[PDB]
Design a protein around this ligand. Structure first.
Ligand SMILES: Cc1cc2nc3c(=O)[nH]c(=O)nc-3n(C[C@H](O)[C@H](O)[C@H](O)COP(=O)(O)O)c2cc1C
Ligand code: SF4
Ligand code: SF4
Ligand code: SF4
Ligand code: FES
Ligand code: FES
Ligand SMILES: [Ca+2]
Lengths: 156, 905, 148
């Protein structure tokens, strides 16, 4: 089963204080659960719905609408490489292929040890310094295929 | 307003959008995401027209007709080449991912997407890539789910959440992977989930009960009928194929139910198809059960009735007005008994007196949605009168509608209206023994015994008007809640008071009448609604008669030696031991019924009556509206040995054979004329429908579509010689395609909606005067009584507060939409949807008795020690046991009764 | 700003109460559309809304709402501090004030510079972005993002 922790619940009510409707804290409640547990499991939908006073169908619609709210289990580190137009011009395909070779997984998949999950993402707003990637909270710019294995070692 | 469509001038309502205005004018614009009852959202982009700035404009621009107001001097073109190309392109884009499913899809021949694909002229596929695919969900026993066929028109979620206030259906994902369904597998929890099969324009949501015995729409035999499963009187189109009732579709009545039914009406029809139904008259000769035809059954019954010294008749609220009247004529008025108990008859007659003598207008079901504050006293409306609960939800959304109208937002721009309103709603106050399904939108809920709910109503009436009797012993917190209700009701322009007989309390109805009278005395436009129990409870109340207790007394004392029971199982209204003893004492028991009931074991004669699908008649609904239901099919068409007649036909022929020793099968209009001649209070049932001589330009009304198939093969296995067409002497309908079903035909009884190019439920647009309004020549059904000039007096009998007596347990009624109605609980598809039998207990009472949730405890009522598992009810007041009314073994007369020696088994 | 009285209750002693929150998104491009932004802020799926009504009359939770880009609100304080006359005489173009303009993608100096309206795209490409990289020839350009 799923049970919301005291810290998660307290953060959810604190975010509920910021709006005139508790439904407006749904995205941040899902993000709080995801930050604590890596992703949003199935019982978290009903738990967040119970805390917020909104239906679970609305919480699941929000969670499946937004791409950065993960409703499937992910690895310990989420690599998000930009596949948009400027990074396409700057050569994100070599970066993606280097990630394919180093991780031995397709995009959207997770490595066998649960260390990394590889994901394409839209433009990171860093197009002048492309190609760009985003590991868990750090953005890496000016990427080259040679520097990718060195970049992946500092995420255990 | 004046619009010019394709160079033709039209006068329209300026407050409408262009789509509903053009559809009301008979023009064809393809559309998906718009619905008349749901408003415009502009999602599917199908309804494109070309709007020009003025008359001297040739460029124009493509606009959504559903999102464009039909303002004065508006120039548009539907048949513009660019508009036609764009509409075809929208259909083509929908077709790129659509599965190759029409032969194995239950929507085929009834599919709005098929109709609009043909209408736009798109028949050539140039898309060559892959189609997206979805997995399906299990949605319970009623709705089948197939997400491949979805066109993402958002009609389902808009209806289910924004209209029906359901919570367990939604839209998930994004871009072209949007999914419509539940967050996980499970039964759809809404009582109005069945309207999805008509709301969805594709075959995503389909009728599973129809899907079991599937047939196409063109193969159906349809009749206009009235739903028999509660007192609301929603208009239905039952469709039959091969002698079995196949489907219940919504029949549009702009006055009563418009587009929507409840799930009990839509899916509770399965008792008609039960194989244990009586199909021939059967006489019990000792231990033998011999089968008679109609004539010798009439002769033998008439001989035995002639030898009897006193014959009594026991009617039922299940039977029609004509059947009850025919029984009353057979046995005499002084020997006629209503089949309901004395307390039920008192409550029903009080509700009738409030309706037709209280001086307060009773609204039709559509009119309920226009009220500004609602007080529901005692009646669990969602479980007993469900469509009234849906209408009450619409009346609750009226506040957002008014707030958006103040901001000059058009009434069809539903998203803007919902955004302006937010969580604001009109005041709703519900009282019950426990929580109701209306508690999510109710401003307040009062969980209390029926005496305390009545006292709350009396206190509300006294605070509204000081001439009303006062209530002594109200706590200050309850006083503050009463004041909240009082300022909400006093400030309302149109308050509505809803009550009924299902609470089992006369005082609840009296308190509701007092509140309505107090609101009427202040000059408010107050309405009152009474929810009865059964389909013809109000008709049986108008007819009158003795109670079932008096009939059982006549049988027990030996004063009556013959009893004719019409369409009544007799166990729902009295204890089974007393009924069985009184029926065993009687030397002649005759049972006229269409369902195999328990009293047929001791019956000397059983007459195989017709159900509503095989019979015609009139039923009076909860608002006093007389409505005619017409026979769907001939039961003797396939099985020629079937002798199953209308109950009024059986009883009229029995009366004729008793009097003149000759049979007389009569005609329906003759029985209706006899009703209106003998009972002047039922004189309005003559005008509920025209007689059997009514024609549309000389031709009858067709029961089946013009493309009805298999005429020379459906009975070919029985005999290669095609039988004679079944003749309908009773009504204006014919048992064939050889009749009229034009949308412009001057009639009010529409068996089914079909127009060329509109095969789906959207053909009801063609059958209406304006889209979403009424039927073109008036909605069927007439009101028996007008609002009286003078009202009643205040009821001064204020009850004392509820006190829990030790060792005595007051029975609190719990009703279920799936299970409380008798015939619908006999339907096989309802058994999975039926809740398990239970008994509700307060936590303090269960702790005092030392029982937990799930432990089986036993109680004795009328000498029947029955055992049920305990579940804990938080909102139930102590000293009460919650029992599910109308279930097997628990009669609805147990409501308000008391229980002894309730202990753990 | 809250600790120094620029935000909160009684800002500058004028009686104006203003509370500023930061709502962090969950990654959809449609959320930047202003009515879809309002839907996302309300905690719903970020579908846009039909206009009229515009958010100025009924926006966030039905209330009057104004949605503005970061750079517009950043242009506001210089207008209020230096005056209208300074803002009109920044450049002799129909579009007033300065704009952040840049060139990106295989140029010598990809970046972002604050320029007056009416600056030619050739001036941004050569004098600021340094032209294309060595060995590359100019083929095309998009002026204002992926949707142009
Ligand atoms: C699909 C779409 C995405 C948009 N994304 C953004 C955005 O990310 N940031 C932004 O400031 N405006 C975005 N806009 C423009 C807004 O709708 C709106 O015009 C703007 O945010 C506020 O107006 P302003 O430029 O006058 O300040 C987007 C528009 C569309 C149609
Ligand atoms: S939903 Fe309509 S178009 Fe689609 S497969 Fe079914 S009948 Fe055919
Ligand atoms: S499931 Fe049906 S009603 Fe719902 S969006 Fe899809 S096609 Fe429309
Ligand atoms: S509300 Fe009553 S009359 Fe209407 S469909 Fe339901 S059971 Fe039938
Ligand atoms: S295109 Fe990759 S960061 Fe913008
Ligand atoms: S019906 Fe108008 S856009 Fe869907
Ligand atoms: Ca008939």
């Amino acid at each position: 089963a799923f049970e919301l922790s005291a810290a998660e619940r307290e953060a959810i009510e604190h975010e509920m204080h910021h709006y005139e409707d508790p439904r407006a804290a749904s995205i941040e409640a899902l993000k709080i659960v995801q930050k604590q547990r890596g992703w949003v499991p199935d019982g978290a939908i009903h738990a967040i719905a119970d805390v917020l006073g909104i239906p679970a169908s609305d919480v699941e619609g929000v969670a499946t609408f937004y791409s950065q709210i993960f409703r499937q289990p992910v690895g310990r580190h989420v690599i998000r490489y930009c596949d948009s137009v400027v990074c396409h011009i700057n050569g994100y395909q070599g970066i993606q292929a280097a990630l394919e070779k180093k991780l031995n997984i397709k995009p959207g998949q997770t490595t066998f040890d649960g260390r990394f999950t590889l994901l394409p993402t839209c433009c990171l707003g860093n197009c002048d310094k492309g190609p760009n990637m985003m590991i868990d909270e750090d953005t890496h710019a000016h990427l080259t295929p040679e520097a990718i294995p060195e970049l992946l070692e500092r995420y255990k | 307003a004046t619009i010019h469509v394709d160079g033709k001038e039209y006068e329209v309502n300026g407050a409408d959008n262009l789509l509903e205005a053009c559809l009301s004018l008979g023009l064809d614009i393809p559309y998906f995401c718009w619905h008349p009852a749901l408003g415009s959202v502009g999602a599917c982009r199908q309804c494109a027209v070309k709007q020009y700035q003025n008359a001297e404009d040739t460029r124009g621009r493509l606009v959504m007709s559903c999102m464009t107001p039909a303002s004065d001097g508006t120039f548009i073109s539907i048949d513009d080449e660019e508009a036609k190309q764009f509409r075809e392109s929208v259909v083509e884009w929908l077709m790129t991912n659509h599965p190759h499913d029409c032969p194995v899809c239950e929507e085929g021949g009834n599919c709005h997407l098929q109709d609009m694909t043909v209408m736009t002229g798109h028949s050539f596929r140039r898309y060559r890539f892959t189609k997206r695919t979805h997995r399906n969900q299990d949605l319970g026993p009623f709705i089948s789910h197939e997400m491949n066929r979805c066109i993402a028109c958002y009609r389902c979620v808009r209806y289910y959440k924004d209209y029906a206030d359901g919570t367990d259906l939604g839209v998930y994902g994004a871009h072209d992977n949007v999914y419509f369904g539940r967050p996980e597998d499970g039964t759809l929890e809404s009582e109005f989930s069945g309207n999805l099969v008509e709301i969805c324009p594709t075959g995503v949501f389909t009728d599973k009960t129809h899907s079991e015995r599937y047939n196409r729409k063109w193969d159906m035999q349809f009749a206009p009928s009235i739903c028999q499963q509660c007192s609301i009187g929603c208009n239905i189109s039952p469709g039959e194929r091969y002698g079995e009732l196949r489907r219940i579709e919504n029949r549009y009545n702009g006055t009563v139910n418009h587009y929507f039914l409840c799930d009990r009406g839509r899916f509770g029809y399965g008792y008609v198809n039960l194989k244990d139904r009586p199909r021939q008259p059967v006489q019990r000769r000792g231990d033998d059960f011999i089968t008679l035809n109609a004539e010798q059954a009439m002769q033998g019954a008439a001989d035995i009735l002639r030898q009897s010294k006193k014959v009594i008749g026991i009617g039922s609220p299940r039977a029609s007005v004509e059947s009850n009247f025919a029984l009353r004529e057979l046995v005499g008025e002084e020997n006629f008994y209503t089949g309901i108990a004395h307390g039920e008859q008192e409550r029903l007659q009080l509700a009738l007196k409030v309706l037709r003598e209280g001086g307060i207008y009773t609204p039709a079901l559509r009119e309920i949605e226009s009220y500004d504050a609602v007080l529901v006293l005692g009646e669990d409306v969602t479980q007993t009168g469900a469509r009234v609960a849906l209408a009450v939800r619409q009346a609750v959304k009226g506040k957002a509608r008014e707030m958006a109208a103040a901001q000059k937002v058009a009434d069809w721009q539903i998203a803007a209206i919902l955004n302006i309103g937010q969580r604001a709603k009109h005041p709703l106050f519900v009282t019950n023994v426990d929580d109701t399904r209306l508690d999510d939108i109710a401003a307040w809920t009062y969980r209390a015994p029926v005496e305390d709910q009545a006292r709350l109503g009396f206190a509300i009436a006294h605070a509204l008007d000081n001439s009303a009797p006062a209530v002594d012993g109200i706590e200050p917190e309850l006083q503050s809640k009463i004041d909240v209700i009082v300022q909400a009701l006093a400030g309302a322009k149109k308050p509505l008071i809803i009550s009924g007989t299902n609470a089992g309390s006369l005082e609840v109805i009296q308190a509701a009448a007092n509140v309505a009278k107090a609101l009427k005395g202040r000059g408010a436009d107050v309405g009152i609604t009474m929810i009865a129990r059964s389909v013809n409870s109000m008709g049986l109340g108008i007819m009158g008669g003795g109670s079932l207790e008096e009939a059982l007394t006549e049988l027990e004392t030996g004063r009556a030696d013959a009893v004719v029971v019409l369409e009544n199982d007799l166990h729902r209204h009295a204890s089974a031991i007393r009924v069985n003893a009184a029926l065993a004492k009687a030397p002649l028991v005759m049972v006229v019924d269409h369902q195999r009931t328990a009293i047929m074991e001791n019956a000397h004669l059983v007459l195989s009556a017709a159900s509503f699908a095989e019979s015609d008649g009139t039923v009076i609904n909860n608002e006093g509206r007389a409505q005619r239901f017409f026979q769907v099919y001939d039961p003797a068409y396939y099985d020629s040995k079937t002798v199953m007649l209308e109950s009024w036909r059986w009883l009229h022929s029995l009366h004729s054979t008793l009097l003149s020793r000759e049979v007389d099968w009569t005609q329906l209009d003759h029985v209706i004329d006899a009703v209106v001649a003998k009972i002047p209070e039922l004189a309005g049932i003559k005008d509920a429908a025209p007689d059997a001589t009514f024609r549309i330009r000389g031709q009858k009304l067709a029961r089946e579509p013009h493309r009805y198939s298999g005429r020379t093969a459906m009975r070919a296995n029985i005999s290669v010689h095609e039988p004679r067409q079944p003749q309908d002497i009773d009504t204006m309908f014919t048992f064939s395609m050889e009749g009229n079903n034009q949308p412009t035909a001057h009639r009010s009884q529409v068996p089914f909606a079909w127009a060329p190019g509109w095969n789906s439920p959207q053909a009801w647009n063609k059958f209406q005067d304006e889209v979403g309004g009424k039927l073109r020549f008036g909605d069927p059904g007439v009101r028996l009584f007008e609002t009286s000039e003078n009202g009643l007096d205040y009821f001064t009998s204020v009850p004392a507060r509820f006190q829990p007596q030790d060792g005595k347990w007051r029975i609190a009624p719990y009703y279920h939409l799936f299970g409380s109605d008798e015939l619908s609980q006999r339907a096989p598809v309802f058994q999975s949807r039926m809740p398990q039998p239970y008994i509700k207990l307060n936590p303090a009472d269960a702790a005092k008795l030392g029982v937990n949730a799930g432990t089986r405890v036993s109680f004795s009522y009328d000498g029947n020690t029955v055992t049920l598992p305990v579940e804990i009810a938080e909102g139930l007041t102590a000293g009460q046991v919650g029992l599910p009314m109308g279930m097997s073994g628990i009669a609805p007369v147990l409501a308000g009764a008391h229980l002894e020696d309730l202990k753990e088994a | 700003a809250t600790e120094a009285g620029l935000l909160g209750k009684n800002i500058m002693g004028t009686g104006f109460d203003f509370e500023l929150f930061v709502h962090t998104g969950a990654g959809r491009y449609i959320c930047g559309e202003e009515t879809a932004l309002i839907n996302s802020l309300e905690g719903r799926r970020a579908n846009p809304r039909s206009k009229p009504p515009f958010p100025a009359t009924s926006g966030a939770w039905g209330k009057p709402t104004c949605v503005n880009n970061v750079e517009t609100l950043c242009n506001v304080p210089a207008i209020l501090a230096n005056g209208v006359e300074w803002y009109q005489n920044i450049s002799k173009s129909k579009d007033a004030g300065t704009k952040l303009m840049g060139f990106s993608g295989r140029v010598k100096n990809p970046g972002l510079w604050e320029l007056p309206f009416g600056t030619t795209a050739r001036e941004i490409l050569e004098d600021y972005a340094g032209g294309m990289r060595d060995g590359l020839k100019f083929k095309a350009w998009q002026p204002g993002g992926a949707g142009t």
